[PDB]
Write an enzyme that holds these catalytic residues in place. Structure first.
Site, short mmCIF file in Angstrom:
data_model
loop_
_atom_site.label_atom_id
_atom_site.label_comp_id
_atom_site.label_asym_id
_atom_site.label_seq_id
_atom_site.Cartn_x
_atom_site.Cartn_y
_atom_site.Cartn_z
N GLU A 35 0.83 -1.22 0.00
CA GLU A 35 0.00 0.00 0.00
C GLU A 35 0.85 1.26 0.00
OE1 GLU A 35 -4.12 -1.35 -0.15
OE2 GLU A 35 -3.00 0.47 -0.62
N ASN A 46 -7.90 9.37 -5.26
CA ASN A 46 -8.84 8.49 -5.95
C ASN A 46 -9.76 9.30 -6.88
OD1 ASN A 46 -7.80 6.29 -4.32
ND2 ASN A 46 -9.03 7.12 -2.64
N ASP A 48 -12.93 9.34 -7.13
CA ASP A 48 -14.16 9.81 -6.45
C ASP A 48 -13.98 11.08 -5.60
OD1 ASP A 48 -12.76 8.70 -4.24
OD2 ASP A 48 -14.58 8.03 -3.28
N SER A 50 -11.86 11.24 -3.10
CA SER A 50 -11.24 10.82 -1.83
C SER A 50 -9.72 10.70 -1.98
CB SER A 50 -11.84 9.51 -1.32
OG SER A 50 -11.42 8.42 -2.12
N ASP A 52 -6.31 8.37 -0.14
CA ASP A 52 -5.83 7.30 0.74
C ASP A 52 -4.62 7.84 1.50
OD1 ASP A 52 -7.70 5.62 -0.64
OD2 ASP A 52 -6.14 4.30 -1.40
N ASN A 59 -8.69 5.52 3.55
CA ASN A 59 -9.28 6.55 2.68
C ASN A 59 -10.23 7.52 3.38
OD1 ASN A 59 -12.26 5.73 2.06
ND2 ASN A 59 -11.14 3.83 1.66
MG LIG Z 1 -3.44 1.32 -2.52
#
Ligand SMILES: [Mg+2]
Ligand SMILES: O=S(=O)(O)c1cc2c(O)c(c1)Cc1cc(S(=O)(=O)O)cc(c1O)Cc1cc(S(=O)(=O)O)cc(c1O)Cc1cc(S(=O)(=O)O)cc(c1O)C2
Ligand SMILES: O=S(=O)(O)c1cc2c(O)c(c1)Cc1cc(S(=O)(=O)O)cc(c1O)Cc1cc(S(=O)(=O)O)cc(c1O)Cc1cc(S(=O)(=O)O)cc(c1O)C2
Ligand SMILES: [Cl-]
Ligand code: NA
Length: 129
Positions: A35, A46, A48, A50, A52, A59
């Protein structure tokens, strides 16, 4: 801050993640690796709206408040900035919430794609735990 695998494994163990909801320590280290590459400062946008955040890429759509993800939730009741701290405490507690809410570790795309059903114990072997 950037952790080495054994350093992160130790911190996660201190924070009670080993076997948390049935997930052995190596799963958590493996998830953090793919990650965030063990980087507490990692951020990814992201489509949308958002973002992370942090070592476990938690998120702003569901879990934290960053003040710039319209119409989102903050189910961990935390500012997203807390997920970017060198101290992994907020990230670990929020991850526990994500998992214990019945989402599993499957919530983490990188874990699902690169960790699940693999030798995750490799992530902690040779560490002095
Ligand atoms: Mg990721
Ligand atoms: O990387 S290591 O696992 O080798 C390590 C061991 C010790 C250390 O003191 C440190 C690293 C430095 C250090 C790191 C971190 S972290 O990177 O943010 O996880 C935190 C601390 C720290 O000293 C502060 C700290 C936190 C906690 S916690 O409340 O459980 O999170 C416990 C301790 C801390 O010093 C005590 C402690 C426990 C442990 S043990 O793993 O429980 O045996 C080893 C060392 C300790 O200092 C001895
Ligand atoms: O995320 S969990 O590790 O808690 C989990 C465990 C089991 C599960 O059945 C599931 C999640 C649900 C699940 C999710 C997915 S996903 O969309 O890829 O995330 C896929 C499946 C699934 O049951 C289907 C499935 C796939 C595979 S794979 O060939 O490795 O991709 C194996 C299995 C599946 O049911 C069997 C299986 C393996 C495992 S193991 O972790 O590999 O030992 C746990 C569970 C399993 O049902 C038992
Ligand atoms: Cl493991
Ligand atoms: Na939010």
């Amino acid at each position: 801050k950037v952790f080495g695998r054994c350093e992160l494994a130790a911190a996660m163990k201190r924070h009670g993640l080993d076997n948390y909801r049935g997930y052995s320590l190596g799963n958590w280290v493996c998830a953090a690796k793919f990650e965030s590459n063990f980087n507490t400062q990692a951020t990814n946008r992201n489509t949308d709206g958002s973002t992370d955040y942090g070592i476990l890429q938690i998120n702003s759509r569901w879990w934290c408040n960053d003040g710039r993800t319209p119409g989102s939730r903050n189910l961990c009741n935390i500012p997203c900035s807390a997920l970017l701290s060198s101290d992994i405490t907020a990230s670990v507690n929020c991850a526990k919430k994500i998992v214990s809410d019945g989402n599993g570790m499957n919530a983490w795309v990188a874990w699902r794609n690169r960790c699940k059903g693999t030798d995750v114990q490799a992530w902690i072997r040779g560490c002095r735990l």
